[PDB]
């Protein structure tokens, strides 16, 4: 899964 | 070009730009 953006 | 659509835990709509490899808010 990708990150979550700041 | 080249995203992805995932729901912020937190609670938010955030998606992912698989063409470069980066996180982003909103759609682009």
Same mark, same amino acid.
């Given at each position: /899964?990708?990150p979550?953006? /700041? | 070009?080249?995203?992805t659509?995932?729901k912020?835990p937190?609670?938010?709509? $955030? $998606? $992912?730009?698989?063409?470069?490899k980066?996180?982003?808010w909103?759609?682009?």
């Amino acid at each position: /899964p990708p990150p979550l953006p /700041p | 070009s080249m995203w992805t659509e995932h729901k912020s835990p937190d609670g938010r709509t $955030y $998606y $992912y730009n698989t063409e470069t490899k980066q996180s982003t808010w909103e759609k682009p």
